[PDB]
């Protein structure tokens with residue numbers, strides 16, 4: 037049986053659906069290069085602000101048996117850096133590039149988008165707009181953010197969404213997203229926000245910022261991620277869903293795709309394993325498909341059976 | 344060292360902080376009796392509606408390696424039934440009783456509370472008002488109005504069962520509302536992480552029937568969210584007690600709930616999977632944890648989680 041993890045979307049061809057989750061292993065040149073050199077089908081740069089940010093005091097990330105918790109504080113090299121990477125450095129012959137943007141205000145997103153436009157046009161970098169860096173838990177702030185970006189940014193882009201936890205919210209968020217035809221992918225999900233990990237041995241939290249509260253990733257978040265992927269897969273039929281959350285194995289990735297994911301992003305697992313993980317994941321996902329007699333992702337994407 | 348899991352709150356003494364989570368093993372008489380006969384410090388009856396509800400088509404619960412997912416649909420024997428249990432059958436000599444209430448409207452809650460009042464007065468049953476039934480607690484206006492309406496007609500302290508929140512803006516907003524109501528003397532954090540979707544890779548299907556497979560997550564999945572909420576509310580509602588609920592499988596998990604601020608610790612998924620004998624193991628495990636850590640009482644470390 038001939039098989040393929042190839043994905044075609046956004047006027048690009050991807051060798052496989054895998055890419056890093058924004059913020060994981062994608063902050064520095066070396067990381068971006070490592071992601072480019074990896075087996076991943078794509079990569080996305082660390083969510084950027086107009087200027088570099090040191091981020092939060094450490095420890096600000098902690099790997100856990102069931103995932104991770106982090107309150108990084110948006111450390112990044114600043115927009116110029118990621119723009120320059122996209123404009124001059126990235127080898128688009130190897131794989132497409134997503135640039136994650138997380139302006140701390142509408143104005144910042146507008147100004148970065150205005151500059152990104154030309155690089156997107158010339159080089160084909162694709163914006164993933166981080167709406168979940170809060171913003172998308174305020175549907176008005178979300179609408180305004182998307183409106184502003186859509187107004188100034190003359191390309192399709194995607195949005196990185198925080199998880200929602202009820203249909204009213206799935207419906208409200210989809211309704212808004214569907215109002216913006218430039219939003220051509222939706223990445224579900226960012227962390228499950230503000231969990232609190234307590235180490236029983238130390239009787240303390242495990243990250244320093246925010247009294248130990250931080251975003252959960254990893255095994256914790258898989259059913260929430262699947263819920264969100266599928267929810268928006270159903271509710272935004274005009275749009276692609278990128279899955280993100282709880283992917284450690286080809287099998288997990290298979291679940292993302294069944295739920296409706298086109299690309300599958302890997303955060304916590306990648307953080308722990310390094311970009312070699314993509315060789316394992318592609319292999320595993322092919323293995324899963326082989327055992328299940330699938331040849332292409334199209335054959336089961338979004339086809340999760342309900343009862 | 345002499346150690347105690349005793350908890351004292353709302354004019355009651357509890358042998359230990361453990362109780363079932365509302366909805367787990369507390370729907371029928373047999374279940375309520377078993378929970379009463381168990382080693383638990385307390386119990387709470389299945390969230391009730393004014394009339395019986397058969398709930399959702401099955402399968403509507405699935406135990407999972409990392410917890411559970413359910414969309415039960417509020418199956419319950421109806422308020423009269425739980426009121427009768429509280430009025431006539433429950434052995435208060437054994438342990439205090441909580442009655443979970445989940446009217447589908449403000450009016451329903453008001454009408455039940457009107458009737459619950461006398462029984463609370465007479466027998467000392469304590470209301471846990473479910474504001475997170477699959478959503479009042481994700482609508483702050485509704486929440487305030489609901490608490491106002493209930494507070495108007497219910498002349499007793501009670502607690503509220505909250506859904507998890509996921510940011511400080513919501514912890515603040517929720518806490519601000521709850522702090523407006525002095526009758527709200529405890530807050531139970533948390534109900535399920537709502538509307539997860541479990542997909543069985545083997546069957547390529549969801550695992551519960553209602554709502555296209557979407558359902559509330561419990562168990563290991565939810566512990567850091569539960570701890571976050573417990574602690575968030577513990578911090579923001581200093582005049583209230585927090586009951587922890589979410590992801591408790593061991594005395595160590597319970598120790599974490601208490602460290603985060605919990606007074607009572609509710610056990611849902613783990614209890615579903617192990618039955619009420621779990622309470623002997625949990626009390627034993629928590630005591631063991633405390634002995635190792637040189638704590639004698641829950642007071643000593645409740646809410647004392649160290650930040651960096």
Ligand SMILES: Cc1cc2nc3c(=O)[nH]c(=O)nc-3n(C[C@H](O)[C@H](O)[C@H](O)COP(=O)(O)O)c2cc1C
Nearest residue numbers: 057058059083225226227253254281282302303304
């Ligand atoms: C250390 C770390 C940094 C992250 N940085 C970003 C980021 O910059 N932008 C973003 O949209 N998400 C960021 N995330 C969230 C991830 O992109 C992903 O949504 C989340 O971790 C769930 O995926 P996982 O379960 O594979 O970890 C970060 C997560 C981690 C753990």
Ligand SMILES: Cc1cc2nc3c(=O)[nH]c(=O)nc-3n(C[C@H](O)[C@H](O)[C@H](O)COP(=O)(O)O)c2cc1C
Nearest residue numbers: 364365366390533534535561562589590610611612
């Ligand atoms: C089968 C089942 C039924 C439940 N029924 C109720 C209920 O009637 N009222 C309520 O407030 N919560 C209900 N819950 C939520 C639990 O009370 C608890 O908030 C949640 O499961 C998290 O606890 P856990 O991790 O120990 O399962 C139910 C949960 C399960 C799994």
Ligand SMILES: O=C(O)c1[nH]c(=O)[nH]c(=O)c1[N+](=O)[O-]
Nearest residue numbers: 083107108109110169227251
């Ligand atoms: O703190 C982070 O960098 C972070 N952590 C996350 O888990 N998700 C994010 O979106 C972000 N962010 O700021 O873009």
Ligand SMILES: O=C(O)c1[nH]c(=O)[nH]c(=O)c1[N+](=O)[O-]
Nearest residue numbers: 390414415416417476535559
């Ligand atoms: O569907 C349930 O019974 C259920 N399941 C939960 O996980 N939480 C609830 O509050 C409720 N409820 O209706 O009261």
